[PDB]
């Protein structure tokens, strides 16, 4: 009974983990979008200076 309760406690914590990881991807994508924009301008500027 205690081993089964422990497996159920792990599954509950796992559902919270999946919810926490989904909220972190949305934030990671936003940051990753800006860095690519900034990084693209810095490349275009660096490319124009070299050209």
């Amino acid at each position: 009974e205690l081993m089964a309760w422990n497996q159920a406690e792990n599954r509950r914590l796992h559902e919270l983990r999946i919810a926490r990881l989904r909220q972190e991807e949305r934030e990671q994508e936003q940051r990753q979008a800006l860095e690519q924009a900034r990084k693209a301008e810095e490349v275009q500027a660096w490319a124009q200076r070299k050209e």
Binding site: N10, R17, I18, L21, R22
Partner: protein, 110 residues
């Protein structure tokens, strides 16, 4: 279930694979310093039978006691490789990881 070997289950780090079908495993236990009352690691070496020679130096293994020792110093057999060196699978998620970072996201398989 009975065995003449004192240590029935022990976890340790593989530190040698130069013996045929035998892994040399460093097992650490916490021992209380009576004067300082602080716990310090005390390490002991155990030889473990590795029939398939699957043990790599540095991986964490679980050793099970044999019913009777099979050699002068071989009193245990490899029961399970807990943490393969550099190829750890996170038990909490089942996904491969490299240190504290996931190699496959737990969100891949939902």
């Amino acid at each position: 279930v009975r065995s003449s070997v004192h240590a029935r289950w022990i976890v340790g780090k593989v530190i040698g694979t130069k013996m045929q079908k035998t892994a040399k495993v460093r097992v650490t236990r916490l021992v209380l310093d009576p004067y300082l009352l602080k716990y310090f690691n005390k390490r002991k070496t155990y030889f473990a039978h590795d029939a398939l020679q699957q043990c790599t130096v540095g991986d964490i293994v679980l050793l099970r006691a044999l019913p009777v020792p099979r050699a002068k110093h071989v009193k245990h057999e490899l029961a399970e490789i807990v943490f393969k060196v550099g190829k750890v699978i996170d038990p909490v998620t089942g996904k491969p990881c490299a240190g504290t970072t996931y190699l496959e996201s737990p969100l891949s398989s939902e």
